[PDB]
Design an enzyme around this catalytic site. Structure first.
Site, PDB file in Angstrom:
ATOM      1  N   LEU A 167       0.830  -1.193   0.000  1.00  0.00           N
ATOM      2  CA  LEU A 167       0.000   0.000   0.000  1.00  0.00           C
ATOM      3  C   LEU A 167       0.875   1.257   0.000  1.00  0.00           C
ATOM      4  O   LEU A 167       2.107   1.196   0.046  1.00  0.00           O
ATOM      5  CB  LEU A 167      -0.935  -0.022   1.206  1.00  0.00           C
ATOM      6  CG  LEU A 167      -1.833  -1.252   1.343  1.00  0.00           C
ATOM      7  CD1 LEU A 167      -2.702  -1.137   2.585  1.00  0.00           C
ATOM      8  CD2 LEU A 167      -2.694  -1.448   0.103  1.00  0.00           C
ATOM      9  N   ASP A 168       0.221   2.417  -0.052  1.00  0.00           N
ATOM     10  CA  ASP A 168       0.910   3.701  -0.122  1.00  0.00           C
ATOM     11  C   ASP A 168       0.157   4.704   0.748  1.00  0.00           C
ATOM     12  O   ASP A 168      -0.754   4.344   1.499  1.00  0.00           O
ATOM     13  CB  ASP A 168       1.031   4.161  -1.582  1.00  0.00           C
ATOM     14  CG  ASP A 168      -0.310   4.263  -2.272  1.00  0.00           C
ATOM     15  OD1 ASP A 168      -1.329   3.899  -1.651  1.00  0.00           O
ATOM     16  OD2 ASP A 168      -0.349   4.706  -3.438  1.00  0.00           O
TER      17      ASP A 168
END
Ligand SMILES: [Mg+2]
Lengths: 79, 69, 217, 50, 115, 111
Positions: A37-38
């Site tokens: 994820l980011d």
């Protein structure tokens, strides 16, 4: 308020999220490397954490957590 | 590249939280459009347009030219 | 002592009673809207009511290029350039839709009809829509701006170099070769300024108009 | 000047003063200017479309 | 007065138009009984060797008092079924299109500026 | 009386998938409420227009002028305009082609 219940419900609502792969959603689940994820994904996830219980945690704080267990502890001891 | 790597985070937070407070529009499609408003253009582009696109996001948040209700 | 040109009537044969009723109605309109003092060349902002909306207010800022007409209908043309498109609008003063008229910059240019701006370069007619007024001393003559202008090259819309226009606000020495100012000066009519019988002497008329205007208070 | 003879205004000669108007009738003497129902007469607030 | 054989500059971002071509767009027909066309009168254009329906949105010819008098004969390309071909309009369009009936609601949902 | 609330409830109860209403400031000119909504098939969009004008005709506005449906000949985009609020029924494709929401929230530039 039960800490075990708190971690159970935050885990549950996290599971409700569709895109996450249920591979390693541990108490210390990392986002950038373990899942990929980011920043947008984690900010959305924390907002979702603020969808049923909470609504008091300022946005500024949420950026220093970046780990589910710290979030659990914060939301448990803040109320 | 951006005016500030963390300002976009605050803008996104405020967008989501104010969108929580809608009375007419569906929250789901508003959220999807808000996701699109950064996902399709605000990834890895040049450092010049960053200011303009942060500006347009922030003025959409401000909303002197129409408040999404 | 400035009497707006509307109240000065055209030379004709209309019955004075018409002008008296005209002026009565006009002055009765000047007490619900302040019709300021503006010369051709000034900059105005006009605020009107949208008839095609549900009661919205419309603002437009521009330069008064022409002021013509008389009586309850006289008008003025505002020219401006928006997004590179040159627009004009012809506004009627006493229309019951114009909410207010801000004289945003009271000026006065060499020629009493700024029509040639349709030919001058786009930047001689561009103005910022959201631009603030400028004050002026009460007991001060209206400033006489001197800005000669530079023209778009070949096809002027109305052939301005002729004597009969008498325009004095264009840079002719640049765009027109010296020769073209000799063919465009065989139309001079040196007898037209000395024709004693074409002069509309309007002193005794503007005097009575002032009596009427002041008495209407 | 006379009343309209077109065959859509044959009526509405009723509310008019029939034989003529006599100023000496003294019936709530008429003001200086009589106006139609739909004239933006002077001295009134500038119109609004809301 | 946008009549037959008059050059009009397409201002709609013109996914089709706005590209170089040695001709310039010309009006070949006006959808009014008489030839003259005023604001809102949708006309036919020969642009890039193709025939496309149009919609006048400004003209140099003086109109009534309170409506704008542009300095270029502006036109928006519209598809046959009324849909505008473009997706934007930058040049100002008059607010005198919300008036007399016609296919104008879509053309105002696509512009951005008025006068 | 007429207001955005009843027409929005109409659309939601009529099972219209997407709704997005943007309020236009009076500093603009066009209107106050500007609504963009979707639908399944061209006949369903025609039905939404049908019902909306039906209620607008049987409710009020004897004083106010009537409202015509614009775009019937088209199939993928229909629209209506009222005295103060305007509605745009669109298929999702053309709706995402004309990125209207960005325009009506960011008037000062193009996209
Ligand atoms: Mg000409």
């Amino acid at each position: 308020l039960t800490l075990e219940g708190i971690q159970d419900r935050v885990l549950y609502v996290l599971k409700l999220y569709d895109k996450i792969d249920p591979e390693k959603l541990s108490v210390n689940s990392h986002f950038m490397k373990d899942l990929g994820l980011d920043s947008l994904d984690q900010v959305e996830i924390i907002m979702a954490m603020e969808d049923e219980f909470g609504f008091e945690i300022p946005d500024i704080d949420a950026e220093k957590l970046m780990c589910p267990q710290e979030i659990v502890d914060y939301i448990a001891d803040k109320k | 590249a951006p005016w500030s790597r963390e300002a976009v985070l605050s803008l996104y937070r405020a967008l989501l939280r104010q969108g929580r407070q809608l009375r007419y529009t569906d929250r789901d499609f508003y959220f999807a459009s808000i996701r699109r408003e950064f996902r399709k253009n605000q990834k890895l582009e040049d450092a010049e347009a960053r200011e303009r696109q942060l500006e347009k996001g922030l003025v959409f948040l401000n909303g002197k030219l129409g408040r999404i209700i | 002592r400035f009497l707006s040109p509307e109240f000065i009537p055209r030379r004709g044969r209309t019955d004075p009673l018409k002008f008296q009723i005209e002026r009565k109605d006009m002055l009765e309109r000047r007490k619900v809207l302040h019709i300021p003092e503006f010369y051709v060349g000034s900059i105005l902002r006009v605020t009107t009511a949208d008839p095609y909306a549900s009661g919205k207010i419309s603002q437009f800022l521009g330069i008064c290029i022409q002021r013509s007409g008389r009586g309850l209908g006289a008008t003025f043309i505002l020219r401006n350039v928006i997004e590179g498109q040159g627009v004009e609008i012809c506004f009627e003063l006493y229309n019951p839709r114009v909410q207010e008229i801000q004289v945003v910059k009271l000026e006065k240019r060499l020629d009493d009809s700024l029509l040639y701006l349709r030919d001058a370069l786009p930047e001689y007619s561009t103005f910022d829509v959201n631009m603030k007024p400028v004050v002026q001393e009460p007991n001060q003559k209206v400033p006489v701006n001197e800005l000669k202008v530079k023209m778009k090259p070949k096809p002027w819309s109305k052939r301005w170099e002729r004597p009969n226009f008498n325009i004095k606000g264009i840079r002719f020495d640049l765009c027109l070769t010296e020769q073209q100012m000799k063919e465009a000066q065989k139309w001079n009519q040196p007898w037209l300024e000395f024709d004693m019988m074409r002069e509309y002497d309007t002193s005794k008329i503007e005097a009575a108009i002032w009596k009427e205007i002041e008495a209407s208070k | 000047v006379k009343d309209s003879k077109l065959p859509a205004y044959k009526d509405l000669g009723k509310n008019l003063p029939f034989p003529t108007y006599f100023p000496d009738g003294d019936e709530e003497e008429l003001p200086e200017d009589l106006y139609d129902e739909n004239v933006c007469q002077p001295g009134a607030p500038s119109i609004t479309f809301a | 007065a946008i009549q037959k054989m008059t050059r009009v500059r397409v201002v709609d971002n013109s996914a089709l138009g706005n590209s170089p071509y040695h001709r310039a767009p010309r009006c070949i027909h006006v959808y009014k009984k008489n030839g003259v066309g005023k604001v809102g009168d949708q006309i036919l254009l020969a642009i890039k060797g193709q025939k496309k329906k149009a919609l006048i949105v400004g003209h140099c010819m003086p109109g009534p008092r309170m409506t704008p008098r542009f300095d270029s004969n502006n036109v928006v390309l519209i598809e046959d079924n009324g849909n505008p071909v473009g997706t934007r309009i930058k040049t100002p369009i008059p607010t005198s299109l919300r008036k007399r009936e016609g296919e104008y609601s879509k053309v105002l949902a696509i512009a951005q500026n008025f006068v | 009386k007429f207001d955005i609330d009843m027409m929005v409830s109409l659309l939601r109860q009529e099972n219209a998938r997407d709704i997005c209403v943007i309020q236009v400031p009076p500093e603009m000119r066009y209107t106050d409420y500007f609504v963009i909504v979707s639908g399944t098939s061209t006949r369903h969009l025609h039905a939404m227009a049908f019902y909306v004008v039906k209620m607008y005709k049987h409710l009020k506005c004897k004083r106010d002028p009537h409202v015509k449906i614009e775009g019937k000949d088209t199939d993928d985009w229909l629209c209506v305009d009222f005295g103060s609020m305007v509605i745009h029924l669109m298929l999702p494709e053309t709706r995402e082609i004309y990125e209207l929401e960005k325009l009506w929230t960011l008037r000062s530039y193009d996209d």
